[PDB]
């Protein structure tokens, strides 16, 4: 209904789906580093 | 967001780097490749000085101080924790000072008006340049440049120059000065007649620049002009910055004693040394 | 939580992913620095002392 | 009083600092508030006002009294944003969001867009004090003459595209500010154009003109009149030639 | 291209003499020259100028004082011309001595400084009188009396009113080039030290403030000049595109502008600060403050 | 092929400008460095400021 | 308490939705940082003290 | 009344939304406080 | 993951090109200065 | 959608291009990385 | 009277909410102070 | 008392929500940096204290 | 007195209304860190000394 | 005295009363600090020293 962009809600679930993919991707890279960094010298 | 007249100047165009990209507003703020830039060094610059003052253990914002690296350091980067810190935020500060003209380079072309105002920056930013590379390069170290911190640059200031006795003695410092005291009288007198015209007594029509120009004329015998003033203030700033960026650069590179002897060669005139009378004789 | 798809609806793509690049990357260097900052966790220093050079 | 303090620490100097910081937070108020006679209320690109109108109020209005009869002019006023607004603009939304440019759709130096653009100023010549017109043909100025530097008249002008399209004819001026504000010039086509004289630069042999191409003098906006122009006139012509540091650069060479 | 710095073509014809709102014409001069070197950059018309009882008082009294203090000055080099020239700077006419108090001075020195210092007090206020008068015979504001009238406070400050609130008038300036930088170093050091004055921080923010703010307005109107924006007053009633372009670099720059009426007041208020802050700091200095440095260590902006 | 080259050169002149600027940089404050060695020797024996 | 949602018939999303980003992003920061000037309860020195290092 | 434009379903409907993120956002700062709670306590 | 490509769909790839290129060279030139401001990692010396 | 204009087939072989270069210059940076840390170790 | 175009009825809306959300946040910072005045108190 | 609702017929509620929004984040803001300037009022030197750390 | 109502008509009650609750908020403000000032009125050292802290 | 009220044709309500307002303030402000400067007037320290505290 509602859309200060122009982007019907079939559009945003598309760029939503990408977007998402590409932050759990950011997000795994970034867990397997912590992880490695707590192994190899923790700060907690 | 928009003035009532802001839409008809919204093109494209006026970039320097890019193109499409990056050309779009944020509110009221025009945001381009140097606009990203000044962003993320203005942004790495604050959270550096605040990650400084919070090792240091202050918060309070009028005892904030990065200071930078000591004189044996020399030219070399120093520890985060002892200098680093500052060169960082100072590489960060020059970095967002230089794109913070160039946006204004790319905002005058899409407007469609002359380059004076980022020229006019390009002072004050090779002022502070003076202060915190080029002389230090020219001293042997960074240690020379002033701190970052609201009265501790103040006190960088006071001994700096009184390592030269009074500073009042430099030349290009007089003309400085001077510079600074006429700009601020024009300004003043200029916002004055501007709105003394505007602004008239009550009962009375609006006036011209007539009416300026002939009380400036009745008051003092001249007029200068409206492009005049406006000249002469922009052209008053800039020669202001010169001559402090040269009272500066000199200062400890080419003159070494304190201030005062310089002007005992006029007194030491070989034609009247020796008279008696007066302060040096 | 299933409807947040609407914030396309509500942000341009082009200045939310400009913004998020700018801020990942500045915030990635500031935690970066901090590390450097402390003699621990320089993992430059620290490896210099653990192997002896 | 040296040491007296109040309570506390508090002595002249602090009550002092404190009440200056009480008058600057005033004196900000009522500067930007001031700055608020022009340009509000703020709008949408669709032309709608707009949610957020700023967090300072827009102030009451003050009125003008204007001489030579030209009447009162009140600011804010909704009649002054509608004789200065621009209808029927020549632009193409670039983005259904907003912050995003709006692109001409045809020459933006004859649709008056972009740095072209013009306000809809009133059709009616800046005046002196005594009712006379500012600016005059040359000819028209009774004692006016080139007491220094180069004099244009029947020069060359030199466009961007290094190619000559008229001579410099006239000169309009100042008359109580004694300068040049516009070179006339005679164009190849048999029409005469004014230019302003902070776009054009002398050289000994010719006058160079590198905002605009040979093909935009033809188009410029001429004056109903001969002997005077109008501040609408003045703004558009001003905006057509400035325009071409941006719409004519791909033709600019040198 | 061109950047509107210098002109490239000069005309003129008859000399503008003025407006007859209120003014005398008979007080008005009938001379004028035009110098081609002033030109290039404003206008060259020199003259006319008005010459009344306002005026003719200052330029008797700041005559008089300037003269005072060169007869001093040539007492104090032995009537030598060479020694004149070769102490020029370092020359002065020194404020009275302390034992003196606020008496009227028994000394030469100090009663050429009382006489010297009462034409400057004659001839500053009738300036400020003639600048008032020569505003309301036009029909115009006085709002450039009211900025004279701030420099007027911070000179009062240093000659008249602190010197007598401390008790002494060995407290004011001299009259010397060298001498007056010596007082103002030697206040500073008599006082803690002056940066640490807020009001001495203040009058530097607004001094500073007055470059930066007229460096962006001249760029700025020197760039909407091919658009007209010098003529303000006009666009001031009439906005042209000028002034919107204007308006427009400065709020995507930094988000706010003014208008063209509007950065004037900025322009008046930065100004007329400089001084209305300082004459404060001044005040504050030896009357309620014996030391700076130690203030701003209670008050928290100096560690301990 | 086409396309390859294409972008290799669209991105290598993205590093040669940002070479040019950083040769830039390090010629001024190597120059200033230089021109500093052949002032006396008491432009290097200054008081530090403390800051 | 049912008509909160009226927010939105007074504040536009955008301009709600960037300053509060910018508030919690600064707020976070802040806080991380008094923490952090704090030695007992910098994690950084803690971890480097509970495991010897 | 509207200063927006936007009709209450329009305005319900976003408040939903930013209501779950709030809740999500504020859920996850819980549990953070309880982990460095029992890390290291401040009260 | 599979639709990447859509990011040439929002930005233009020749600046992007560009763009990345300066950025690239410039951390690495970063990195390489900050390697040489250390004796142990610096291999000229 | 295309704000850019690229159709999804124009897109697809420009980031098959782009990925080819990407994994071209990790391979690189990765090999640099062993010899480097052959060299001097820094964990 | 009105200086910016709100009825009684819309008016009195609008105030019924923000009545709520007041009295919702001094709820709060009712428990809060309770809360600290357990813990420390000041009086 | 019962007609305070008219203070949105002569207040606009926007203006009025944000300028309490940040009077009322810098009331808090100020009495916690109050309280955190008082060694006795400062929870985390407190908490400091009262564990042993 | 009955007629005290009349300043409405010679001001406007939106410049009043905000400048009232400056005016109040500063002073109230201004008391309060008087008070804190002198030891003896300072709530926060009074309720220190009193529990024994 | 009988024709004082004619100083409101002479003078406009509005500036008088703001002016009157403002001048009676910060006459009482400065009033209200000469006393408590001295320590006899001063009303806290004497209260402090009538009820020993
Ligand atoms: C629209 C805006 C307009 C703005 C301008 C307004 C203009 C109109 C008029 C406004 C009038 C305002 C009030 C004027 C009169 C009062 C002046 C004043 O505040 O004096 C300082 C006043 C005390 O006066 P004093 O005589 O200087 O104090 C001597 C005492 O012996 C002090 O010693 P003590 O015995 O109390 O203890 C000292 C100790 C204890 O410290 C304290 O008790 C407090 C110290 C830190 C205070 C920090 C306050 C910060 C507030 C920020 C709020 C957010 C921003 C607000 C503005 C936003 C917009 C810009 O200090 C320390 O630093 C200890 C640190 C920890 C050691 C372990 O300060 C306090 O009482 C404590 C701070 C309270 C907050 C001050 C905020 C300013
Ligand atoms: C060692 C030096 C001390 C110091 C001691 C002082 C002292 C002492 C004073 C200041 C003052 C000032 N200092 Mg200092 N100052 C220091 C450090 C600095 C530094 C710096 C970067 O280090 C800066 C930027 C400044 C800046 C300033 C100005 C902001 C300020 C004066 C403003 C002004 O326009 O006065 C100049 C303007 C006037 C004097 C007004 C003149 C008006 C009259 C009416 C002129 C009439 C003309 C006459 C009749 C003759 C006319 C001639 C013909 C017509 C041609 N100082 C250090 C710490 N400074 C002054 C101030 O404001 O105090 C806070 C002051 O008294
Ligand atoms: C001809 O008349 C004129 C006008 O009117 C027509 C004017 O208005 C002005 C303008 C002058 C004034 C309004 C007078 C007052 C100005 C001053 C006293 C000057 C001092 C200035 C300031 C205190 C303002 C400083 C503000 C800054 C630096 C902006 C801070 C903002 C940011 C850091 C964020 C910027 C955002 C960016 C770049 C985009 C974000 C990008 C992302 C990726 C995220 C002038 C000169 C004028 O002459
Ligand atoms: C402290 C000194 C100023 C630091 C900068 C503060 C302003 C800022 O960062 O953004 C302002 C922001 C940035 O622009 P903006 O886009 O938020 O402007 C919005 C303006 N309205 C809402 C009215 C449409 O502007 C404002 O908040 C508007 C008014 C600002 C006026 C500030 C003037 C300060 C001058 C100080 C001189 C005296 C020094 C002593
Ligand atoms: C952002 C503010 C952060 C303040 C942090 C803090 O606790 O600072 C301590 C300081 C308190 O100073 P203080 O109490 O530490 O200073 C004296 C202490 N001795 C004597 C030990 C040195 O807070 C401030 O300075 C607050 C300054 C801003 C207050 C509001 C000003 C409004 C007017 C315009 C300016
Ligand atoms: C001071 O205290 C310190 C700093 C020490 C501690 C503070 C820490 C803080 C404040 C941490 C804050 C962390 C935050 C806020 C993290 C946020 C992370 C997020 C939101 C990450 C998001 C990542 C998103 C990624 C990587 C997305 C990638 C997307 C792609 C690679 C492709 C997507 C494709 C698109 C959009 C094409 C679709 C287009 C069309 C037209 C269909
Ligand atoms: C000095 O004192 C110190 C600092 C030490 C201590 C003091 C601390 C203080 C004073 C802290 C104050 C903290 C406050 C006030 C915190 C407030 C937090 C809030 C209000 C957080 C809210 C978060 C909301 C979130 C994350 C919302 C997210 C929403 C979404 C993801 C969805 C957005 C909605 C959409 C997309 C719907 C759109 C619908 C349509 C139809 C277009
Ligand atoms: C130095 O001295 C110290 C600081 C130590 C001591 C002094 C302290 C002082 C002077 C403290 C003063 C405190 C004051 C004056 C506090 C005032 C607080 C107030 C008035 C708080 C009000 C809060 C209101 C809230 C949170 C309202 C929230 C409302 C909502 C969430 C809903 C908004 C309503 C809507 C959307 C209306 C519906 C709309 C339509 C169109 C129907
Ligand atoms: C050195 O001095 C110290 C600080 C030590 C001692 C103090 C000195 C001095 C000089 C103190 C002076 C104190 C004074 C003058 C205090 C005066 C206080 C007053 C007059 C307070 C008045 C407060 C009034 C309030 C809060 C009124 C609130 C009203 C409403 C919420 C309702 C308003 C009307 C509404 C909403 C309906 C409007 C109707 C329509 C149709 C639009
Ligand atoms: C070749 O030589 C001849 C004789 C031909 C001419 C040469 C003249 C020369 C060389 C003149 C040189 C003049 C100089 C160097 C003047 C310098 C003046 C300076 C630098 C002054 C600086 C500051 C002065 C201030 C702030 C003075 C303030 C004075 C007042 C506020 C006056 C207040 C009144 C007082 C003290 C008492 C008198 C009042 C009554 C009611 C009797
Ligand atoms: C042993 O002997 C004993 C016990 C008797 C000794 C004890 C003595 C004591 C306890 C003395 C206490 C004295 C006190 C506490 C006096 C209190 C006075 C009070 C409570 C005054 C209350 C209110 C005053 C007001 C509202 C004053 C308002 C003044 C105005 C000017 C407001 C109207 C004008 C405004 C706001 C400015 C604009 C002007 C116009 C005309 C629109
Ligand atoms: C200050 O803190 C320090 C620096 C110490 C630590 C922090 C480091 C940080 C924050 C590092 C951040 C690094 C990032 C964000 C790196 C991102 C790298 C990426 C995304 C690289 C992508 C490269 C892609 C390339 C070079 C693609 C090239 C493609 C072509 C040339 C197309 C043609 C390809 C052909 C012909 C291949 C044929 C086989
Ligand atoms: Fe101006």
């Given at each position: 209904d509602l859309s200060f962009t122009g982007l019907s809600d079939e559009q945003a679930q598309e760029l939503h789906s990408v977007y998402m993919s590409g932050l759990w991707l950011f997000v795994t890279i970034a867990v397997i580093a912590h992880i490695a960094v707590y192994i190899w010298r923790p700060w907690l | 967001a928009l003035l009532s007249f802001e839409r008809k100047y919204r093109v494209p165009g006026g970039t320097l780097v890019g193109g499409n990209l990056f050309?779009?507003?944020?509110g009221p703020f025009y945001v381009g490749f140097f606009g990203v830039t000044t962003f993320f060094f203005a942004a790495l610059g604050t959270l550096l000085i605040l990650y400084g003052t919070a090792m240091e253990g202050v918060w309070n914002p009028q005892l904030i101080s990065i200071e930078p690296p000591s004189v044996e350091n020399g030219l070399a980067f120093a520890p985060l924790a002892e200098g680093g810190l500052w060169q960082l935020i100072t590489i960060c500060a020059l970095g967002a000072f230089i794109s913070w003209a160039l946006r204004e380079v790319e905002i005058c072309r899409k407007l469609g008006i002359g380059l004076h105002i980022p020229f006019a920056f390009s002072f004050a930013i090779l002022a502070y340049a003076v202060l915190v590379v080029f002389r230090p390069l020219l001293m042997g170290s960074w240690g020379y440049a002033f701190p970052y911190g609201i009265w501790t640059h103040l006190d960088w200031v006071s001994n700096t120059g009184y390592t030269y006795g009074?500073?009042?003695?430099n030349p290009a410092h007089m003309l400085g000065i001077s510079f600074f005291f006429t700009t601020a009288l024009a300004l003043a007198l200029h916002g004055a007649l501007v709105l003394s015209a505007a602004?008239?007594?009550?009962?009375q029509e609006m006036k011209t620049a007539d009416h300026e120009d002939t009380f400036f004329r009745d008051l003092v015998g001249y007029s200068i002009g409206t492009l005049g003033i406006h000249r002469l203030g922009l052209l008053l700033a800039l020669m202001a910055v010169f001559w402090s960026a040269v009272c500066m650069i000199i200062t400890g590179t080419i003159w070494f004693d304190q201030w005062s002897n310089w002007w005992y060669w006029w007194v030491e005139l070989p034609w009247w040394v020796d008279i008696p009378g007066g302060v040096n004789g | 939580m299933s409807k947040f798809y609407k914030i396309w609806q509500v942000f341009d793509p082009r200045r939310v992913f400009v913004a998020q690049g700018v801020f990942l990357f500045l915030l990635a260097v500031m935690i970066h620095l901090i590390l450097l900052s402390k003699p621990d966790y320089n993992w430059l220093d620290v490896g210099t002392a653990k192997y002896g050079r | 009083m040296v040491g007296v303090n109040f309570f506390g620490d508090f002595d002249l100097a602090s009550l002092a600092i404190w009440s200056f910081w009480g008058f600057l937070a005033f004196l900000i108020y009522y500067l930007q508030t001031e700055n608020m006679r022009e340009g509000y209320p703020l709008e949408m690109e669709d032309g709608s006002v707009a949610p957020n109108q700023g967090l300072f109020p827009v102030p009451k209005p003050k009125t003008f009294k204007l001489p030579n009869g030209r009447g009162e002019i009140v600011m804010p006023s909704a009649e002054n944003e509608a004789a200065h607004r621009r209808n029927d603009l020549a632009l193409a939304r670039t983005?259904?969001?907003?912050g995003f440019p709006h692109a001409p759709t045809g020459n933006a130096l004859v649709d008056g867009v972009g740095p072209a653009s013009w306000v809809p100023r009133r059709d009616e010549p800046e005046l002196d004090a005594h009712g006379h017109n500012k600016i005059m043909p040359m000819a028209l100025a009774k004692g006016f003459n080139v007491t220094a530097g180069r004099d244009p008249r029947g020069l060359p002008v030199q466009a961007a595209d290094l190619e000559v399209v008229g001579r410099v004819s006239e000169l309009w001026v100042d008359v109580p500010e004694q300068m040049v504000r516009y070179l006339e010039i005679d164009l190849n086509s048999g029409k005469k154009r004014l230019v302003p004289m902070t776009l054009a630069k002398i050289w000994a042999d010719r006058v160079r003109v590198n905002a605009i191409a040979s093909d935009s003098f033809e188009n410029i906006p001429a004056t109903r009149s001969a002997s005077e122009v109008t501040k609408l006139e003045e703004d558009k012509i001003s905006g057509y030639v400035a325009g071409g540091w941006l719409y004519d650069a791909d033709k600019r060479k040198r | 291209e061109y950047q509107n710095i210098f002109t490239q073509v000069q005309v003129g014809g008859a000399p503008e003499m003025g407006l007859v709102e209120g003014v005398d014409l008979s007080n008005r001069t009938k001379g004028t020259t035009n110098w081609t070197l002033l030109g290039w950059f404003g206008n060259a018309q020199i003259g006319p100028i008005y010459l009344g009882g306002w005026g003719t008082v200052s330029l008797i009294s700041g005559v008089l004082w300037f003269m005072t203090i060169g007869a001093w000055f040539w007492y104090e080099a032995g009537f030598n011309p060479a020694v004149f020239m070769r102490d020029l700077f370092y020359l002065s006419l020194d404020a009275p001595?302390?034992?003196?108090?606020?008496?009227?001075?028994?000394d030469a020195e100090g009663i050429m400084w009382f006489i010297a210092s009462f034409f400057m007090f004659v001839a500053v206020w009738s300036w400020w009188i003639r600048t008032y008068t020569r505003a309301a015979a036009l029909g115009m504001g006085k709002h450039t009396a009211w900025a004279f009238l701030s420099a007027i406070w911070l000179w009062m400050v240093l000659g008249f009113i602190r010197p007598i609130l401390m008790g002494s008038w060995s407290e004011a300036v001299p009259y010397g080039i060298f001498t007056h930088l010596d007082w103002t170093n030697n206040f500073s050091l008599t006082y803690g030290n002056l940066f640490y004055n807020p009001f001495h921080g203040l009058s530097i923010a607004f001094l500073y403030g007055s470059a930066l703010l007229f460096a962006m307005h001249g760029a700025t109107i020197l760039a909407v000049s091919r658009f007209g924006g010098d003529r303000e007053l006009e666009q001031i009633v009439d906005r042209g595109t000028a002034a919107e372009r204007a308006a427009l670099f400065w709020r995507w720059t930094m988000g706010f502008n003014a208008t063209m009426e509007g950065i004037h007041r900025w322009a008046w208020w930065f100004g007329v600060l400089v001084t209305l802050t300082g004459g404060i700091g001044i005040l504050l200095s030896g009357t309620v403050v014996d030391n700076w440095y130690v203030w701003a260590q209670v008050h928290g902006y100096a560690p301990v | 092929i086409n396309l390859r080259v294409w972008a290799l050169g669209q991105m290598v002149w993205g590093a040669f400008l940002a070479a040019v600027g950083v040769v830039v940089v390090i010629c001024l404050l190597v120059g200033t460095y230089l021109a500093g060695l052949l002032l006396p020797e008491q432009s290097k024996q200054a008081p530090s400021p403390y800051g």
């Amino acid at each position: 209904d509602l859309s200060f962009t122009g982007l019907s809600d079939e559009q945003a679930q598309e760029l939503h789906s990408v977007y998402m993919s590409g932050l759990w991707l950011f997000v795994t890279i970034a867990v397997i580093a912590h992880i490695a960094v707590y192994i190899w010298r923790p700060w907690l | 967001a928009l003035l009532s007249f802001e839409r008809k100047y919204r093109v494209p165009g006026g970039t320097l780097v890019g193109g499409n990209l990056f050309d779009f507003w944020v509110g009221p703020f025009y945001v381009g490749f140097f606009g990203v830039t000044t962003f993320f060094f203005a942004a790495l610059g604050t959270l550096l000085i605040l990650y400084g003052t919070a090792m240091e253990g202050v918060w309070n914002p009028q005892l904030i101080s990065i200071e930078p690296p000591s004189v044996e350091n020399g030219l070399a980067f120093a520890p985060l924790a002892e200098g680093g810190l500052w060169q960082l935020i100072t590489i960060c500060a020059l970095g967002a000072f230089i794109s913070w003209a160039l946006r204004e380079v790319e905002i005058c072309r899409k407007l469609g008006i002359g380059l004076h105002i980022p020229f006019a920056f390009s002072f004050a930013i090779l002022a502070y340049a003076v202060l915190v590379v080029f002389r230090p390069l020219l001293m042997g170290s960074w240690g020379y440049a002033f701190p970052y911190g609201i009265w501790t640059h103040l006190d960088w200031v006071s001994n700096t120059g009184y390592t030269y006795g009074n500073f009042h003695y430099n030349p290009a410092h007089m003309l400085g000065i001077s510079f600074f005291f006429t700009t601020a009288l024009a300004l003043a007198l200029h916002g004055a007649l501007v709105l003394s015209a505007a602004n008239p007594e009550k009962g009375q029509e609006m006036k011209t620049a007539d009416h300026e120009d002939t009380f400036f004329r009745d008051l003092v015998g001249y007029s200068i002009g409206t492009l005049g003033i406006h000249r002469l203030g922009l052209l008053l700033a800039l020669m202001a910055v010169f001559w402090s960026a040269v009272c500066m650069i000199i200062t400890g590179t080419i003159w070494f004693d304190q201030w005062s002897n310089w002007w005992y060669w006029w007194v030491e005139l070989p034609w009247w040394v020796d008279i008696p009378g007066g302060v040096n004789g | 939580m299933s409807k947040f798809y609407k914030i396309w609806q509500v942000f341009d793509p082009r200045r939310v992913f400009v913004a998020q690049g700018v801020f990942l990357f500045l915030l990635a260097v500031m935690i970066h620095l901090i590390l450097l900052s402390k003699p621990d966790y320089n993992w430059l220093d620290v490896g210099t002392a653990k192997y002896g050079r | 009083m040296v040491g007296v303090n109040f309570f506390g620490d508090f002595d002249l100097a602090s009550l002092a600092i404190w009440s200056f910081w009480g008058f600057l937070a005033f004196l900000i108020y009522y500067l930007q508030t001031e700055n608020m006679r022009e340009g509000y209320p703020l709008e949408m690109e669709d032309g709608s006002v707009a949610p957020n109108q700023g967090l300072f109020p827009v102030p009451k209005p003050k009125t003008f009294k204007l001489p030579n009869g030209r009447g009162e002019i009140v600011m804010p006023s909704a009649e002054n944003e509608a004789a200065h607004r621009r209808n029927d603009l020549a632009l193409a939304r670039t983005s259904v969001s907003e912050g995003f440019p709006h692109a001409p759709t045809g020459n933006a130096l004859v649709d008056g867009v972009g740095p072209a653009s013009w306000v809809p100023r009133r059709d009616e010549p800046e005046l002196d004090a005594h009712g006379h017109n500012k600016i005059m043909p040359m000819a028209l100025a009774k004692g006016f003459n080139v007491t220094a530097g180069r004099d244009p008249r029947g020069l060359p002008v030199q466009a961007a595209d290094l190619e000559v399209v008229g001579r410099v004819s006239e000169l309009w001026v100042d008359v109580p500010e004694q300068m040049v504000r516009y070179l006339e010039i005679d164009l190849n086509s048999g029409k005469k154009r004014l230019v302003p004289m902070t776009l054009a630069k002398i050289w000994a042999d010719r006058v160079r003109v590198n905002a605009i191409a040979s093909d935009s003098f033809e188009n410029i906006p001429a004056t109903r009149s001969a002997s005077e122009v109008t501040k609408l006139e003045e703004d558009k012509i001003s905006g057509y030639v400035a325009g071409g540091w941006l719409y004519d650069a791909d033709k600019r060479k040198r | 291209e061109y950047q509107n710095i210098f002109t490239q073509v000069q005309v003129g014809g008859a000399p503008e003499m003025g407006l007859v709102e209120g003014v005398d014409l008979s007080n008005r001069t009938k001379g004028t020259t035009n110098w081609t070197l002033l030109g290039w950059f404003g206008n060259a018309q020199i003259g006319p100028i008005y010459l009344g009882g306002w005026g003719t008082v200052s330029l008797i009294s700041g005559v008089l004082w300037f003269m005072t203090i060169g007869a001093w000055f040539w007492y104090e080099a032995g009537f030598n011309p060479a020694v004149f020239m070769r102490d020029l700077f370092y020359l002065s006419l020194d404020a009275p001595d302390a034992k003196y108090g606020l008496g009227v001075p028994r000394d030469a020195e100090g009663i050429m400084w009382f006489i010297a210092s009462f034409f400057m007090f004659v001839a500053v206020w009738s300036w400020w009188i003639r600048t008032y008068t020569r505003a309301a015979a036009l029909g115009m504001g006085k709002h450039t009396a009211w900025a004279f009238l701030s420099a007027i406070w911070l000179w009062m400050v240093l000659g008249f009113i602190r010197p007598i609130l401390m008790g002494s008038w060995s407290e004011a300036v001299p009259y010397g080039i060298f001498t007056h930088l010596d007082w103002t170093n030697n206040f500073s050091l008599t006082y803690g030290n002056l940066f640490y004055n807020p009001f001495h921080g203040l009058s530097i923010a607004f001094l500073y403030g007055s470059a930066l703010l007229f460096a962006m307005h001249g760029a700025t109107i020197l760039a909407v000049s091919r658009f007209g924006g010098d003529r303000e007053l006009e666009q001031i009633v009439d906005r042209g595109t000028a002034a919107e372009r204007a308006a427009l670099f400065w709020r995507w720059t930094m988000g706010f502008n003014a208008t063209m009426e509007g950065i004037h007041r900025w322009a008046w208020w930065f100004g007329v600060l400089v001084t209305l802050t300082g004459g404060i700091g001044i005040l504050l200095s030896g009357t309620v403050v014996d030391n700076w440095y130690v203030w701003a260590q209670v008050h928290g902006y100096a560690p301990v | 092929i086409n396309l390859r080259v294409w972008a290799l050169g669209q991105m290598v002149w993205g590093a040669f400008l940002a070479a040019v600027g950083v040769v830039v940089v390090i010629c001024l404050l190597v120059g200033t460095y230089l021109a500093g060695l052949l002032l006396p020797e008491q432009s290097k024996q200054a008081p530090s400021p403390y800051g």
